[PDB]
A paper describes a structure:
Here, we showcase the example of ADGRG4, an orphan aGPCR that possesses a PTX-like domain at its very N-terminal tip, followed by an extremely long stalk containing serine-threonine repeats. Using X-ray crystallography and biophysical methods, we determined the structure of this unusual PTX-like domain and provide experimental evidence for a homodimer equilibrium of this domain which is Ca2+-independent and driven by intermolecular contacts that differ vastly from the known soluble PTXs. However, only three domains are predicted by homology within this huge ECR—the PTX-like domain, the hormone receptor binding motif (HRM), and the GPCR autoproteolysis-inducing (GAIN) domain. Our data alongside of theoretical considerations lead to the hypothesis that ADGRG4 acts as an in vivo sensor for shear forces in enterochromaffin and Paneth cells of the small intestine.
The crystallographic data revealed a β-sandwich fold. Six and seven antiparallel β-strands assemble the two β-sheets A and B, respectively. The A face is covered by another loop of residues 189 to 205 with a short helical stretch. This loop coordinates a metal ion via the side chain carboxy group of the residue D202. Two disulfide bridges stabilize the protein fold. C58-C123 links strands β3 and β8 in the β-sheet of the A face. C200-C228 connects the long A face loop 189-205 with the C-terminal residues of the PTX-like domain. The unit cell of the G4-PTX crystals on the other hand contained only a single protein chain in the asymmetric unit. However, there is only one interface generated by point symmetry that exhibits a sufficient surface area for homodimerization. Two protomers interact such that the two strands at the edge of the sandwiched β-sheet interact with those of the other molecule (β7 with β10′ and β10 with β7′).
Numbering used by the authors:
A (entry chain A), B (entry chain A): 26 to 162, 176 to 231
């Protein structure tokens, strides 16, 4: 299924997920962005996207890459390590969160719209290949939109220019939906007839 | 020299530093806190405290532990890795910043007063022993006060209770001053006649 012009209303929907049909190749550098909106003020732990490999099916404890959080925190997973920062994100407003991984330098950065909020150093490492990307997956407390993944480092000034990822693009017919109906919203940030 | 009842006015003083006379032992877990106040609104890169070992005298690029920042960021150094977070700290107000290192779990946390702002995961590792602790060292753009280091993990609720570190304590006669005159200020948070 293509998600062009559509968002994913995950709020309250515990047995729902969306997954990318294509496995993802080995990436030394990449940028991954998603748009999200929280539809409740005080939430529990949540996941927006996760990249799951065989590492995870052992005890369900190790995620190669993911964006998660709680009511006061954003949480990044990298190769089983976690990095958590305090956030004050408003509910009922769309936010764009982008992650940059420079596997050559071993640098992981998190942005809110054009502004960097976290830079972490870890082992230089590529992205482990052939995992599966999951969205929303208890369920994300709101809506998700416009996931993109590029095999290179985007500059801040490009994050909001409504580009399509060259590895994963929302608009492509690459998505598997489980018990969720994507919905059209012509007010969405990058919507174009 | 003892720093009891005194602060260190480093603002604008480029060739000044304070160092701890005692070398620090190997620590598997520790808490380190300092009070700081910025005396200019828009600042450049600064360091509040650093723990320097022989790793650093090679090209002056690797710091085993340090707290640094710029006008919009707080920066933690651990064994040469950096972790940077966006901050919005007000000038002309005292802030208490505490770091917790759990070398058993490989967990490094940063707090502003009682509130956690960063949790990072890294290699489980102890603190490298016998380095030298430096304060202020171009110079820190304001004043520093009440550095403490304990060989155990303090809970949030204790950070502001004006305890003395059991490894390093501000009030002990353990400090070497270079070209700075510590100043008494009876309004300081933990001052007691
Ligand atoms: Mg396009
Ligand atoms: Mg005392």
């Amino acid at each position: 299924l293509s998600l062009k012009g559509k968002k994913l209303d995950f709020f309250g929907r515990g047995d729902t997920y969306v997954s990318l049909i294509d496995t993802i190749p080995e990436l030394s550098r990449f940028t991954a962005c998603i748009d999200l909106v929280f539809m409740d003020d005080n939430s529990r732990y949540w996941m927006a996207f996760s990249y799951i490999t065989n590492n995870a099916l052992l005890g369900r404890e190790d995620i190669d890459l993911g964006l998660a959080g709680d009511h006061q925190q954003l949480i990044l997973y990298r190769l089983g390590k976690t990095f958590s920062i305090r956030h004050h994100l408003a509910s009922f407003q769309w936010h764009t969160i982008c992650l940059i991984w420079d596997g050559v330098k071993g640098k992981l950065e998190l942005f809110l719209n054009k502004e960097r909020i976290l830079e972490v150093t870890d082992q230089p490492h590529n992205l482990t290949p052939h995992g599966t990307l999951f969205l929303g997956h208890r369920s994300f407390p709101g809506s998700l939109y416009y996931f993109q993944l590029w095999d290179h480092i985007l500059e801040n000034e490009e994050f909001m220019k409504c580009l399509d990822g060259n590895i994963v693009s929302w608009e492509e017919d690459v998505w598997l939906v489980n018990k969720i109906i994507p919905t059209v919203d012509r007010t969405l940030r990058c919507f174009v007839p």
